[PDB]
């Protein structure tokens, strides 16, 4: 991502908890780290959006991309297949 | 006259070492030279045995070649599926080379010969029992077994709630042997009709004997392909037939519970509050905590029954500590996690 989508965080709305969580998840640990292994909790390694189609998965993805610092690496499914073997 | 004489020793001392290095950085330089002339060798499988001095490999991606040994090469090394190097040109075998890799094989083959105390599994200490009654005595004296006639004690169940730790049963009965422990849960070994077998039914027992004693753990066999006569015939096929290296399958899920169907068949209770302490205090081990930290009044007020539902009260509640820099829990927060949990999970 080199435009850097802009998406405050209050266009998205009705998901405060799983805004809360996918910045806690996604987020928290990124930039403090050693706070986490100061407690000891593993965070978890990955996210996974699921829910009716529409309901704004990809809005969170744009805002976390948005009002992240992190080199946020979007891409699709169907781009990764490719008729090469071993392309994918 | 001496200073100066020992001076010129250190000048000339320097060229020595300087040289040697030299010759030994020029030593590099012929060695690369001398690989360099060296070429490449095809990698293929050794399909199938001819004769004496004739082999059948099918290069790796590539036509399959009839081609002869070098000369002084092991020919029992070269057996079926050995991996070998032909030569480029005379498409002779070369030397053999370790077959390793693999995309399927990462969890019907790694051995785990850890150490897991039963403490880490709590409130089990009776379940626990029966697997060390049933996984123990065929392990250690198969001559009493066979003494007495009956060979095969295999089968067994865990039936009981989703996932209360029955791989820690599995796990915390790996105190001795139990190296491979494989997991197939669920997958590979009949997928609905006969999908998997001996490629996905065999290869286990394969290491399950090229190596010190596992555990099938077919566990979540409730959710294979997902028949049942193919199951029945699953069940009943050359598997006990060798029952190599005292290897016994755990299957765990929720006339097929007869002996040589199912073994003893054992179900895992709800976690008891006075076990959940149990828990509590295992899982709650590693997160930094205070000393005023109570995991007493907790079960009271968290009984949801589920094994994973004290480990994120445990996690969830450093997640209450993740705003704010407390580096411990308190009594409280706890409390506010298992009010959470123990609701959230309702929901
Ligand atoms: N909770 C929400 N807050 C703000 N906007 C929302 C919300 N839910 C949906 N939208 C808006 O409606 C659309 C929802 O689809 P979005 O672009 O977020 O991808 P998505 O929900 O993952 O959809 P799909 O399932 O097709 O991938 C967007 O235009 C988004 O701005
Ligand atoms: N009684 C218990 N003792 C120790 N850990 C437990 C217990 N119950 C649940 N767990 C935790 O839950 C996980 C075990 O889940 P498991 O029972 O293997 O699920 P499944 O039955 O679906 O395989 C482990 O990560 C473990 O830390
Ligand atoms: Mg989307």
Same mark, same amino acid.
């Given at each position: ?7 405050? %965080?209050?266009?998205? $709305?009705?998901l ?8 806690? =998840?996604?987020?928290?640990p990124?930039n403090?780290?050693?706070?986490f292994?100061?407690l000891?909790?593993?965070p978890?390694?990955?996210?996974l959006? %699921?829910?009716?189609? $529409?309901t704004?998965?990809?809005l969170?993805?744009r805002?976390?991309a =948005? ?5 946020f ?5 169907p781009?990764?297949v ?6 994918g | 006259?001496?200073?100066?004489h020992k ?6 001392k320097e060229?020595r070492?300087?040289?040697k ?8 330089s012929?060695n ?6 060296s ?11 001819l004769?004496?001095e004739?082999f059948?490999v099918?290069?790796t ?8 040994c ?16 032909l ?6 075998i ?7 890799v693999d995309?399927?094989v ?9 150490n897991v105390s039963y403490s ?19 392990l ?5 077994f ?14 009981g709630?989703?996932g ?13 042997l139990?190296?491979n422990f494989?997991?197939?849960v ?6 609905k ?6 490629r ?12 010190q004693?596992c555990?099938?753990?077919m ?17 009943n ?5 060798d029952?190599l ?15 040589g169907?199912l ?8 976690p008891?509050?006075?076990?959940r302490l149990?828990?509590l205090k295992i899982?709650?081990?590693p ?13 009271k ?6 094994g994973?539902?004290?480990?994120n009260v ?9 705003r ?5 829990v308190?009594?409280?927060?706890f409390?506010?996690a298992?009010?959470?949990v123990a ?5």
């Amino acid at each position: 991502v080199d435009e850097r989508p802009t998406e405050q %965080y209050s266009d998205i $709305g009705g998901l405060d908890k799983q805004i809360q969580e996918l910045v806690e =998840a996604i987020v928290l640990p990124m930039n403090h780290k050693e706070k986490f292994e100061n407690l000891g909790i593993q965070p978890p390694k990955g996210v996974l959006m %699921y829910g009716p189609p $529409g309901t704004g998965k990809t809005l969170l993805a744009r805002a976390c991309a =948005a009002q992240t610092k992190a080199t946020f690496l979007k891409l699709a499914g169907p781009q990764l297949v490719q008729m090469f073997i071993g392309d994918g | 006259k001496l200073l100066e004489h020992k001076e010129i020793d250190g000048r000339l001392k320097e060229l020595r070492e300087q040289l040697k290095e030299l010759t030994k950085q020029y030593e590099k330089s012929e060695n690369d030279l001398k690989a360099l002339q060296s070429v490449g060798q095809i990698v293929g499988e050794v399909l199938k045995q001819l004769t004496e001095e004739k082999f059948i490999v099918k290069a790796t991606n590539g036509p399959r070649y009839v081609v002869g040994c070098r000369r002084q090469l092991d020919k029992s090394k070269l057996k079926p599926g050995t991996r070998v190097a032909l030569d480029m040109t005379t498409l002779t075998i070369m030397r053999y080379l370790p077959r390793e890799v693999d995309p399927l094989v990462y969890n019907m083959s790694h051995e785990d010969p850890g150490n897991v105390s039963y403490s880490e599994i709590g409130g089990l200490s009776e379940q626990i029992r029966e697997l060390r009654e049933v996984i123990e005595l065929p392990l250690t004296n198969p001559e009493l077994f066979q003494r007495v006639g009956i060979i095969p004690p295999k089968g067994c169940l865990l039936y009981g709630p989703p996932g209360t730790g029955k791989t820690l049963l599995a796990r915390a009965v790996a105190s001795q042997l139990d190296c491979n422990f494989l997991k197939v849960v669920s997958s590979s070994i009949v997928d609905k009709y006969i999908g998997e077998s001996a490629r996905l039914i065999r290869e286990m027992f394969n290491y399950a004997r090229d190596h010190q004693p596992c555990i099938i753990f077919m566990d979540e066999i409730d959710a294979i392909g997902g028949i049942q006569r193919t199951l029945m015939e699953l069940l009943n096929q050359m598997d006990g037939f060798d029952t190599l290296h005292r290897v016994k399958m755990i299957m765990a899920t929720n006339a097929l519970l007869r002996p040589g169907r199912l073994d003893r068949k054992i179900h895992i209770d709800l976690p008891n509050e006075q076990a959940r302490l149990d828990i509590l205090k295992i899982h709650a081990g590693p997160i930094t905590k205070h000393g005023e930290i109570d995991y007493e009044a907790i079960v009271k007020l968290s009984d949801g029954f589920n094994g994973a539902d004290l480990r994120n009260v445990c996690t969830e509640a450093g997640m209450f500590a993740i705003r704010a820099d407390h580096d411990f829990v308190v009594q409280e927060d706890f409390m506010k996690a298992v009010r959470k949990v123990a609701d959230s999970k309702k929901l």
